[PDB]
Design a binder for this molecule. Sequence first.
Ligand SMILES: *[C@@H]1O[C@H](CO)[C@@H](O[C@@H]2O[C@H](CO)[C@@H](O[C@@H]3O[C@H](CO)[C@@H](O)[C@H](O)[C@H]3NC(C)=O)[C@H](O)[C@H]2NC(C)=O)[C@H](O)[C@H]1NC(C)=O
Ligand SMILES: *[C@@H]1O[C@H](CO)[C@@H](O[C@@H]2O[C@H](CO)[C@@H](O[C@@H]3O[C@H](CO)[C@@H](O)[C@H](O)[C@H]3NC(C)=O)[C@H](O)[C@H]2NC(C)=O)[C@H](O)[C@H]1NC(C)=O
Ligand SMILES: *[C@@H]1O[C@H](CO)[C@@H](O[C@@H]2O[C@H](CO)[C@@H](O[C@@H]3O[C@H](CO)[C@@H](O)[C@H](O)[C@H]3NC(C)=O)[C@H](O)[C@H]2NC(C)=O)[C@H](O)[C@H]1NC(C)=O
Ligand SMILES: *[C@@H]1O[C@H](CO)[C@@H](O[C@@H]2O[C@H](CO)[C@@H](O)[C@H](O)[C@H]2NC(C)=O)[C@H](O)[C@H]1NC(C)=O
Ligand SMILES: *[C@@H]1O[C@H](CO)[C@@H](O[C@@H]2O[C@H](CO)[C@@H](O)[C@H](O)[C@H]2NC(C)=O)[C@H](O)[C@H]1NC(C)=O
Ligand SMILES: *[C@@H]1O[C@H](CO)[C@@H](O[C@@H]2O[C@H](CO)[C@@H](O)[C@H](O)[C@H]2NC(C)=O)[C@H](O)[C@H]1NC(C)=O
Ligand SMILES: *[C@@H]1O[C@H](CO)[C@@H](O[C@@H]2O[C@H](CO)[C@@H](O)[C@H](O)[C@H]2NC(C)=O)[C@H](O)[C@H]1NC(C)=O
Ligand SMILES: *[C@@H]1O[C@H](CO)[C@@H](O[C@@H]2O[C@H](CO)[C@@H](O)[C@H](O)[C@H]2NC(C)=O)[C@H](O)[C@H]1NC(C)=O
Ligand SMILES: *[C@@H]1O[C@H](CO)[C@@H](O[C@@H]2O[C@H](CO)[C@@H](O)[C@H](O)[C@H]2NC(C)=O)[C@H](O)[C@H]1NC(C)=O
Ligand SMILES: *[C@@H]1O[C@H](CO)[C@@H](O[C@@H]2O[C@H](CO)[C@@H](O)[C@H](O)[C@H]2NC(C)=O)[C@H](O)[C@H]1NC(C)=O
Ligand code: NAG
Ligand code: NAG
Ligand code: NAG
Ligand code: NAG
Ligand code: NAG
Ligand code: NAG
Ligand code: NAG
Ligand code: NAG
Ligand code: NAG
Ligand code: NAG
Ligand code: NAG
Ligand code: NAG
Ligand code: NAG
Ligand code: NAG
Ligand code: NAG
Ligand code: NAG
Lengths: 48, 993, 327, 48
Amino acid sequence: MASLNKNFGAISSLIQEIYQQLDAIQANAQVDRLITGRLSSLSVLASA
Amino acid sequence: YDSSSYVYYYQSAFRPPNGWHLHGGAYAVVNISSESNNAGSSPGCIVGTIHGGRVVNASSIAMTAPSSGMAWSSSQFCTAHCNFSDTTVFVTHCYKYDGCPITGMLQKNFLRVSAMKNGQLFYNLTVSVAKYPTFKSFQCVNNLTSVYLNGDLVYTSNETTDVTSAGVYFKAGGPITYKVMREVKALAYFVNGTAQDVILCDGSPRGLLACQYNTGNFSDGFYPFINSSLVKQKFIVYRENSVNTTFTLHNFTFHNETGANPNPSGVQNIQTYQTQTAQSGYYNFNFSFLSSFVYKESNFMYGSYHPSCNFRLETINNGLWFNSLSVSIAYGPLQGGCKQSVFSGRATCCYAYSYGGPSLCKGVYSGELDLNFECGLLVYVTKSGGSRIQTATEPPVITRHNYNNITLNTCVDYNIYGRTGQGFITNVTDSAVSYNYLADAGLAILDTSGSIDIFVVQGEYGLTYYKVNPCEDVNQQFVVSGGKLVGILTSRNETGSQLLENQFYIKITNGTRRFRRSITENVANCPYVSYGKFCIKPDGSIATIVPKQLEQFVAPLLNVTENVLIPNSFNLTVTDEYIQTRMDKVQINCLQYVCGNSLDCRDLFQQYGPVCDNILSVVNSIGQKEDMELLNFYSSTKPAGFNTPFLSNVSTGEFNISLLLTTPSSPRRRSFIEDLLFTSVAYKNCTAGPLGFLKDLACAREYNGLLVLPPIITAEMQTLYTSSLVASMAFGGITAAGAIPFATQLQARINHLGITQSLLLKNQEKIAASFNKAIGRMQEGFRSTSLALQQIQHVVNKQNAILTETMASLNKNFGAISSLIQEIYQQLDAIQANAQVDRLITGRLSSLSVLASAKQAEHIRVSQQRELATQKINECVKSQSIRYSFCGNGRHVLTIPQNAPNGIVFIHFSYTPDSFVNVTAIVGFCVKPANASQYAIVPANGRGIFIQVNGSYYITARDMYMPRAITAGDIVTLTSCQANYVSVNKTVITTFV
Amino acid sequence: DEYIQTRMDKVQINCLQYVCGNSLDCRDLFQQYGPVCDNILSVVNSIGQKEDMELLNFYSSTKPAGFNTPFLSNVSTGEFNISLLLTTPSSPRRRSFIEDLLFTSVAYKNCTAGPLGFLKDLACAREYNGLLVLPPIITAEMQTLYTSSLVASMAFGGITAAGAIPFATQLQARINHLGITQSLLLKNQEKIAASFNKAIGRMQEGFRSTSLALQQIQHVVNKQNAILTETMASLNKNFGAISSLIQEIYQQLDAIQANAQVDRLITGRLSSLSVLASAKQAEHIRVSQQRELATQKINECVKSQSIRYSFCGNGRHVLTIPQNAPN
Amino acid sequence: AVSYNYLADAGLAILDTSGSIDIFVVQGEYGLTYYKVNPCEDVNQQFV
Ligand SMILES: *[C@@H]1O[C@H](CO)[C@@H](O[C@@H]2O[C@H](CO)[C@@H](O[C@@H]3O[C@H](CO)[C@@H](O)[C@H](O)[C@H]3NC(C)=O)[C@H](O)[C@H]2NC(C)=O)[C@H](O)[C@H]1NC(C)=O
Ligand SMILES: *[C@@H]1O[C@H](CO)[C@@H](O[C@@H]2O[C@H](CO)[C@@H](O[C@@H]3O[C@H](CO)[C@@H](O)[C@H](O)[C@H]3NC(C)=O)[C@H](O)[C@H]2NC(C)=O)[C@H](O)[C@H]1NC(C)=O
Ligand SMILES: *[C@@H]1O[C@H](CO)[C@@H](O[C@@H]2O[C@H](CO)[C@@H](O[C@@H]3O[C@H](CO)[C@@H](O)[C@H](O)[C@H]3NC(C)=O)[C@H](O)[C@H]2NC(C)=O)[C@H](O)[C@H]1NC(C)=O
Ligand SMILES: *[C@@H]1O[C@H](CO)[C@@H](O[C@@H]2O[C@H](CO)[C@@H](O)[C@H](O)[C@H]2NC(C)=O)[C@H](O)[C@H]1NC(C)=O
Ligand SMILES: *[C@@H]1O[C@H](CO)[C@@H](O[C@@H]2O[C@H](CO)[C@@H](O)[C@H](O)[C@H]2NC(C)=O)[C@H](O)[C@H]1NC(C)=O
Ligand SMILES: *[C@@H]1O[C@H](CO)[C@@H](O[C@@H]2O[C@H](CO)[C@@H](O)[C@H](O)[C@H]2NC(C)=O)[C@H](O)[C@H]1NC(C)=O
Ligand SMILES: *[C@@H]1O[C@H](CO)[C@@H](O[C@@H]2O[C@H](CO)[C@@H](O)[C@H](O)[C@H]2NC(C)=O)[C@H](O)[C@H]1NC(C)=O
Ligand SMILES: *[C@@H]1O[C@H](CO)[C@@H](O[C@@H]2O[C@H](CO)[C@@H](O)[C@H](O)[C@H]2NC(C)=O)[C@H](O)[C@H]1NC(C)=O
Ligand SMILES: *[C@@H]1O[C@H](CO)[C@@H](O[C@@H]2O[C@H](CO)[C@@H](O)[C@H](O)[C@H]2NC(C)=O)[C@H](O)[C@H]1NC(C)=O
Ligand SMILES: *[C@@H]1O[C@H](CO)[C@@H](O[C@@H]2O[C@H](CO)[C@@H](O)[C@H](O)[C@H]2NC(C)=O)[C@H](O)[C@H]1NC(C)=O
Ligand SMILES: *[C@@H]1O[C@H](CO)[C@@H](O)[C@H](O)[C@H]1NC(C)=O
Ligand SMILES: *[C@@H]1O[C@H](CO)[C@@H](O)[C@H](O)[C@H]1NC(C)=O
Ligand SMILES: *[C@@H]1O[C@H](CO)[C@@H](O)[C@H](O)[C@H]1NC(C)=O
Ligand SMILES: *[C@@H]1O[C@H](CO)[C@@H](O)[C@H](O)[C@H]1NC(C)=O
Ligand SMILES: *[C@@H]1O[C@H](CO)[C@@H](O)[C@H](O)[C@H]1NC(C)=O
Ligand SMILES: *[C@@H]1O[C@H](CO)[C@@H](O)[C@H](O)[C@H]1NC(C)=O
Ligand SMILES: *[C@@H]1O[C@H](CO)[C@@H](O)[C@H](O)[C@H]1NC(C)=O
Ligand SMILES: *[C@@H]1O[C@H](CO)[C@@H](O)[C@H](O)[C@H]1NC(C)=O
Ligand SMILES: *[C@@H]1O[C@H](CO)[C@@H](O)[C@H](O)[C@H]1NC(C)=O
Ligand SMILES: *[C@@H]1O[C@H](CO)[C@@H](O)[C@H](O)[C@H]1NC(C)=O
Ligand SMILES: *[C@@H]1O[C@H](CO)[C@@H](O)[C@H](O)[C@H]1NC(C)=O
Ligand SMILES: *[C@@H]1O[C@H](CO)[C@@H](O)[C@H](O)[C@H]1NC(C)=O
Ligand SMILES: *[C@@H]1O[C@H](CO)[C@@H](O)[C@H](O)[C@H]1NC(C)=O
Ligand SMILES: *[C@@H]1O[C@H](CO)[C@@H](O)[C@H](O)[C@H]1NC(C)=O
Ligand SMILES: *[C@@H]1O[C@H](CO)[C@@H](O)[C@H](O)[C@H]1NC(C)=O
Ligand SMILES: *[C@@H]1O[C@H](CO)[C@@H](O)[C@H](O)[C@H]1NC(C)=O
């Protein structure tokens, strides 16, 4: 649960204000990194 | 490193630590040639003379000496120079006679490595005779023009010039060796920063393992590999058109023309001043628009909009696959050309080249169309992803040749549909003209990873279907066993003299040509390398495996009268096993492990707060959870104290058990058998003083932050545990009077299988001879074929291999530019380095996560075996329960535990007799008494079936042939008998007066 | 009933042929990823050896004496219809009825040509991506005699084969150990027959609808299939990259910009192999646990009839009969 | 280290892993020596 505010290689933690600060077609790399990190955290949960 | 097959060559004066490491340089040999005693009539070679050459035009040279023999003194060694096309390099130990201005006649002087052009001298450096003790080798390398007095650099310059001659003066000594060489890849094992040996990548079977898996001193087991080599018939299948075609690619050209005016205010008011389209077949695009046209990198408003089309415009001509394609050029504005002309426009994506244009251009955007901008040409491209047209550069060479002749069942190269592979091709259309195996769109089927599984071809009487499977060497293995290579376990048949299960087997020739084929031998058990009913020795030859099993008996189950087999004599068959019971606790210091000894890297680290808490909490939890119930396990089984050595000079009766217990003369409290266990495998001062080859990795661990903690049972508190446990097994019972330390326990424990206690003068030396033969088989069994030793080996190797990969995970850089962090900030920018440092720190904390998870899994394993250990200590040692074949493949008698590497080793003693007797048996009686009554007698439980001997009648136990008169308490009275009896007219109770 | 797993399919990851495809390139870029293939190979080699040694220990501790006799259930017993439970004469495989009912709910090939089935022919899709198997140290058609020899030692162990006693006398001399006598005749002989006939009637009713072994078979087979069939479908799943296949990364864009993409993709695929090796080691710990429980229950519940109350089968047990299963 | 040929004929430092220095050399005395670098007293302190 406390793995949500922990941002990955990114610029911020919440996803509502990633699209509001910078460009459209440059934000998708940031969003892909963040979603891949959160699904890695769920993989750790299921293995434990 | 001065052998007759390679020359070493130290990579630039620093040394990476103890382990294998790879390089690339001129290391091989070709044309080894010898030479000796290049001196005249003089008693010693005079210093400073440069003559004595030998013309060699090669890409290297090397002058090597015998192994550290040629000293620098008089009558032993002189100049030994190369020369390049114009410049020379000559060493000279110019000790004084009159000649050079050095003025020294002793050792502890210097040398002269000095270059020399046609008339003058430069680059005098004077290295001491210290750090260069003995002339070993001397190279001259082509590329970078550098020269190498043994090992490191002495001189470089600018040019790239090949060696033209070389030559050495010396009076006497070892015969010197000239050799030229080529450039290969090799890797060198070196400890303490000096080379021992190298492994070349010369296509040898020993070489390929090291060159692909980056290691030597390999583990045992299997290893896959490759050797790619193919110059054979390649065949190409192009995309067939309708009918009757010669595949000719069309040429679409472009040119900047005398264009029109720039556009007015509307984004529909920009006109494409060219148009082309793709229809079918092949194409290429001649773009001559690299001439002084810069590419504009995409950003927030202006530039290209190449997302949704990952290729750049100068890379269309490589092999792509589209579905419909049309490009066109248009001279619009620059700030809002693509970002408006993609969404509301007419293209999927567009590019934006620029040039020197006049700044009178009316831009297109909602509300901002009243300014003046630049006019760079912007090309359009309308991509739709698919497979209908293919773009290629060279014209296809299949010129009026319908596909009639392509090869089958041979390892070929193939380039079909623009995807290069390497395999062979079968014919599968018999199973595919049915089952509608492809639909009405007939082309290939991709599998995963972008290869081709089934494709089609057209042009014969009917269309066929071909399948692509890889070649014979897509997965070859070669078996290593113990310490060295044995043979290649392949899939092909190169006159392979042995067939294993579903794989063919060859064997590499080791010296002599013989020892290739033999008759297989039957092995009981083998721990070496096992592969599917076949076992491979380190000798090289295989031997088939077939497991043995021992006999057992439950034999008395008696219906109608017939003689039965019960044992009279008995033997003991030993059996060992090993159970792990302890664990080394760790303590990860994350701050000192991630960053090095630096002033920085820490302020960047202090926003990685909770991940060190997460990596610390699980290690702290497993440490506490192990350390509590380890003391529970110690306090549940340590019997009473009994702090008595019992050091095996105690006089027993006839049982030689002094082999199995501790000796008086030893520095450690250790018996013989666990010493044999130890020879197969926490108080230090880490600042100064080494101990050993393997225990002194603790200083390499503690300087990287992976330290250990002592257990709650201290050292020299577990070495009394085993002795106290066997002391309670022996002394427990008797009051120590009458020569009974170990014997009486065994005889009073062996007669529980029958039904008596502690019988004397019968069954006393039979037990002695049987137990002596049992310990003889025991002392034979450990060294060659046992069960505990290989378990010890696997457990010790896994416990070492957990931690020795999270130390060698430091030089392994992640997505980064280097491994160490001290020289990331020194090479590049400040605010660009932080992404690199974040990637590297995230990778190292991922490695610590892997370490903590592996440690928790190993703790679950050892807690499982520890609770099984306390159960077996509570039952098999001090109890002798009647559970059949719980411990030691039979109804067990006694066990003796011993020490081990972080475990305990049991020695079980079974009970399996073989010699039987042939005695007649009966199942019951029904005596009739005198006046009026009737009853039967059935033998009770736990007292065994009863037999007869030569007239009388006797009961006996079910395991020991021990005749005895029937008593009154072993009967069952029943008011029935059904002629399956004996029916004696007189009573057979044998009561007393 | 109950089911206990006791075996494991050994794997052999060929990392060089799994990461890159059939290409001339991708390999020179791969040859600086040296020790990570050694790390992914060593744990698989270790679990293979550690399974393959004590599997032969488990086979040599319980295979009773030989007894290489078929005992194919036309042997005339007294009144016990046990021919439902043992093997039949007319069958291509040495298989009884009940484990055939177990099998219908769920290593010699030539992969170059010739299919076999819908599910067994995934081995050619595995071997062309570098996830191949190895045969066990007990060979095929060496485990199908194991169950028959074990029930042959449970039946014939004892008598000297004279007097129509293949299976009955073992049961009557094992049932009177709860009281205190041995092998009583002409009382308690048909009562046991009627009770055991009703018991095998409830047994032949029980397997098809409501049993305990069948769903355990289902969950174990589905997990053993689902471990490997996600690390094959992890190939088309691209990582942070531009595409999935590696043949057409070098053809679309620049040379010195493609190497970051290729490094990300290769690091992702080696992470997937790390997940595979860790899952295989955890499953080996599971099967070693159930295998040592298996040798304990073979040593006690089959050949001994100990008096431990409700160890195996919810009461003071009489006799057990083992049968084959999926692994 | 004057025995055991503890460095070869190219005498400079030995890197360990993570880019630090384990053993280096120095020159200028009667004979060349060998020095070892180990971290300070507080490289791993703990508090319970
Ligand atoms: C690639 O093609 C471009 C379009 O054909 C060329 O750019 C053209 O250069 C002309 C010469 O400078 C310009 O003509 C002038 O335009 C201005 C308006 O900004 C008028 O006032 C001038 O009278 C007029 N000169 C005349 C009529 O002699 C074109 O306007 C200009 N086209 C544009 C900007 O779209 C490039 O020069 C050409 N590059 C090459 C050949 O390398
Ligand atoms: C892969 O297998 C295919 C299936 O057998 C082969 O295709 C066969 O080729 C034969 C010879 O070219 C054809 O036989 C001809 O059939 C016609 C009409 O049936 C007859 O008039 C001809 O006399 C006969 N030729 C003879 C008897 O010599 C088969 O019809 C054809 N089968 C098909 C298309 O399904 C492929 O040739 C084979 N691949 C290779 C490389 O050999
Ligand atoms: C680290 O240990 C080194 C090994 O002991 C020290 O090096 C030693 O220094 C001594 C004094 O400088 C030398 O003694 C001299 O040896 C010469 C020839 O052997 C004699 O002629 C001198 O009289 C003698 N000096 C005396 C007795 O005062 C040792 O030879 C020398 N050992 C070597 C080089 O192996 C280092 O000094 C020491 N480091 C520090 C910082 O002290
Ligand atoms: C190798 O280099 C040596 C050193 O320069 C060359 O020796 C010189 O040769 C020229 C003409 O051959 C003489 O004029 C010089 O006097 C020589 N040098 C000395 C110091 O005597 C030698 O020629 C070179 N080898 C070849 C094959 O050219
Ligand atoms: C390397 O050492 C030699 C020593 O011989 C230097 O040679 C001297 O050069 C100067 C200038 O050319 C002459 O005046 C001297 O007579 C030479 N010394 C002799 C012949 O003994 C040479 O200059 C040095 N190289 C340098 C400093 O680059
Ligand atoms: C690693 O491999 C090297 C081979 O280069 C081993 O070094 C040999 O060890 C034996 C053991 O006595 C010596 O007889 C040889 O002379 C050594 N050869 C060289 C070139 O030094 C080394 O022991 C291995 N290390 C292990 C297995 O830990
Ligand atoms: C590298 O340095 C170590 C440290 O001295 C050497 O290890 C010693 O080896 C000798 C064998 O001749 C043992 O007698 C010593 O006890 C070892 N020292 C220890 C354990 O501290 C090692 O031999 C060196 N490697 C070489 C010279 O190749
Ligand atoms: C129990 O006591 C008896 C009686 O002392 C021991 O029997 C003696 O055994 C030794 C060894 O064979 C003989 O030499 C003696 O003659 C025996 N004594 C007799 C017959 O009176 C017996 O060994 C003891 N049991 C032990 C020590 O385990
Ligand atoms: C896809 O191809 C396979 C391979 O032929 C087809 O599988 C065959 O199906 C038939 C009947 O369904 C069986 O008799 C064969 O034994 C199968 N062959 C195998 C498993 O190798 C499959 O039916 C095809 N799918 C279709 C036509 O939809
Ligand atoms: C043990 O032997 C007796 C023989 O006395 C067997 O008893 C026979 O049982 C069958 C089946 O009920 C009867 O038809 C016979 O008449 C019995 N024989 C007699 C009474 O003499 C008994 O079955 C045997 N036990 C076994 C085979 O387990
Ligand atoms: C090869 O060796 C022979 C040995 O006599 C020698 O004569 C010849 O010059 C050598 N060739 C080279 C070094 O190219
Ligand atoms: C290099 O040396 C060889 C030695 O025989 C000679 O044949 C060749 O002509 C030489 N090349 C030159 C001087 O360019
Ligand atoms: C070594 O020399 C060859 C000569 O062709 C050159 O191609 C190669 O780049 C050189 N290696 C270096 C400079 O590392
Ligand atoms: C290489 O460097 C030297 C150093 O002065 C110079 O004289 C020479 O011209 C250079 N070679 C070139 C530029 O090809
Ligand atoms: C691999 O191929 C090379 C090329 O011919 C060959 O020399 C080598 O023996 C092969 N390795 C084997 C068969 O292990
Ligand atoms: C132009 O196309 C023709 C075929 O239409 C082809 O022969 C020729 O090579 C092409 N020109 C090129 C590729 O420069
Ligand atoms: C593109 O067209 C120009 C026009 O002259 C020609 O010179 C050039 O060779 C062509 N490029 C090709 C065919 O790659
Ligand atoms: C392999 O080749 C040998 C020839 O030495 C042959 O005798 C053997 O039968 C072959 N193995 C096969 C066909 O499985
Ligand atoms: C069993 O014991 C007898 C007599 O004690 C002996 O002759 C025989 O060799 C033994 N068998 C073994 C140890 O296998
Ligand atoms: C056995 O060894 C101990 C060790 O000191 C000694 O005290 C004792 O006297 C020895 N027993 C003998 C010599 O009978
Ligand atoms: C026990 O066996 C060892 C093995 O060599 C022997 O040295 C010792 O004398 C024996 N002790 C006896 C027979 O009492
Ligand atoms: C142990 O290490 C300490 C650390 O300061 C040092 O003072 C002491 O001399 C060492 N003891 C030895 C080398 O015996
Ligand atoms: C016991 O002896 C009898 C007669 O001598 C024989 O028929 C029987 O087979 C023997 N039992 C054995 C050898 O087990
Ligand atoms: C039982 O089946 C076997 C297998 O063919 C046969 O040999 C035997 O005669 C059969 N028993 C009968 C028919 O009583
Ligand atoms: C045992 O039961 C099966 C089940 O149908 C039956 O076919 C067989 O005849 C029975 N055998 C007997 C009663 O001996
Ligand atoms: C088995 O595969 C080999 C591969 O070369 C082939 O030669 C052989 O004909 C195949 N056997 C069949 C399909 O029965």
